[PDB]
Design a binder for this molecule. Structure first.
Ligand SMILES: CC(C)[C@@H](NC(=O)[C@H](CS)NC(=O)CCC[C@H](N)C(=O)O)C(=O)O
Length: 328
């Protein structure tokens, strides 16, 4: 099995005012986006050591009682309004992975989208402060940190495509973004449940099958355990781990709006029996956000693709991924 070319891109110029330097960053984003579709963002400014430490303390201290109280409706029939946000339970002997998902901290009972009961919008559920002191404050602060990184990356993608730097970012707003953080625990287990291992067509043991991401872009932290593979025409290639950087790739909404000029890379998660963390931030826009598709390969940029509302995209995409690859 070969190794994918995943460049490390210093994204620090995207936080600054040196326009030529931002253009050199954009060129590197463009080149990675048209090759394997992945790159590591380095010099990103986020304290990933603290992220990893506070996530670990959470995963290792939460109890079965608390997991039921936080569970999404797939695991608790009482929580009919928790489709996205809350706890995704493991099943001993059957399902190894478990995770906690939270959304925009600004979705409160008073928020107009929550009052209108708009699909894909939910109010976050949190554990008890006295049992997990500081966890919610940390988690909400992390949301806005990674929001800020993601904003800057979106300026890079816009410049890469020949657009003004706010082309995407203007639709990525603290008041209405559907972006989510997921804090995923992949446990070490001995014996490891066979039901939690999937076998690929090519014989590879997997934790999660091939997919395109449901996102504009995906901004991922992982601990230093190799697990991801990306599909190329010549087969799947291993993505090397780097627990100092954020791994970035496009989701299928970027592919839609660029007429597949920036493909959403197909990737999958290999089975590794190792205790690790996978902490994606899915960059979603607002429910009513629509970006007119264009084709950068054409002088005039004309595209025949229909504009697609981000809310409709996301609603269908999340369900399709569950149907295709299973409830996580
Ligand atoms: C590879 C990582 C991104 C991670 N995979 C994942 O998180 C997988 C594939 S991209 N993603 C999902 O299941 C979508 C979760 C969406 C979330 N519930 C929400 O409501 O917004 C993993 O480690 O399995």
């Amino acid at each position: 099995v070969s190794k994918a070319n995943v460049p490390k891109i210093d994204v620090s110029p995207l936080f600054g005012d040196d326009q030529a330097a931002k253009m050199r960053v954009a060129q590197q984003i463009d080149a990675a986006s048209r090759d394997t579709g992945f790159f590591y963002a380095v010099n990103h400014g986020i304290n990933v050591q603290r992220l990893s430490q506070k996530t670990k303390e959470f995963h290792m201290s939460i109890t079965p009682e608390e997991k039921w109280d936080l569970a999404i409706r797939a695991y608790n029939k009482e929580h009919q309004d928790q489709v996205r946000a809350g706890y995704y339970l493991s099943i001993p002997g059957k399902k190894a992975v478990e995770s906690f998902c939270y959304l925009n901290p600004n979705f409160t009972p008073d928020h107009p989208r929550i009052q209108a009961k708009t699909p894909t919008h939910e109010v976050n559920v949190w554990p008890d402060e006295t049992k997990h002191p500081g966890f919610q404050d940390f988690a909400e602060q992390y949301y806005w940190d990674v929001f800020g990184l993601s904003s800057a990356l979106l300026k890079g993608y816009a410049l890469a495509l020949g657009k003004e730097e706010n082309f995407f970012a203007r639709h990525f707003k603290p008041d209405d973004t559907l972006a989510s953080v997921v804090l995923i625990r992949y446990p070490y287990l001995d014996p490891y449940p066979e039901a939690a291992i999937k076998t690929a067509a090519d014989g590879t043991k997997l934790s999660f099958e091939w997919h395109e991401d449901v996102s504009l872009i995906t901004v991922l932290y992982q601990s230093n355990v190799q697990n991801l593979q990306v599909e190329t025409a010549a087969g799947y290639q291993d993505i090397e781990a780097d627990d100092t950087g954020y791994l970035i790739n496009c989701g299928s909404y970027m592919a839609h709006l660029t007429n597949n000029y920036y493909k959403a890379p197909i990737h999958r998660v290999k089975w590794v029996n190792a205790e690790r963390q996978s902490l994606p931030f899915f960059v979603n826009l607002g429910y009513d956000s629509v970006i007119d598709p264009f084709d950068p390969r054409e002088p005039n940029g004309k595209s025949d693709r229909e504009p697609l509302s981000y809310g409709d995209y996301l609603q269908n995409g999340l369900v399709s991924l569950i149907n295709k690859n299973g409830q996580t």
